[PDB]
Amino acid sequence: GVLIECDPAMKQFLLYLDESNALGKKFIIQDIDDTHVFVIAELVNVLQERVGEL
């Protein structure tokens, strides 16, 4: 997978997109801890657009 280090309060932000996006089967494939998540490789550049509202 793709190791992504984030904030514990921000981990659930990517989980809401998993239950909303209907592109693939499941966005998040594995959750290590509150500061480590995994992902099919393709949405880091798309997430940069959501920084303006975050």
Binding site: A9, Q12, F13
Partner: peptide, 12 residues
């Protein structure tokens, strides 16, 4: 810094 849960509901 905003607390994690509070930020979760705020953004949600």
């Amino acid at each position: 810094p905003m607390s994690p849960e509070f930020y979760r509901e705020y953004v949600a």
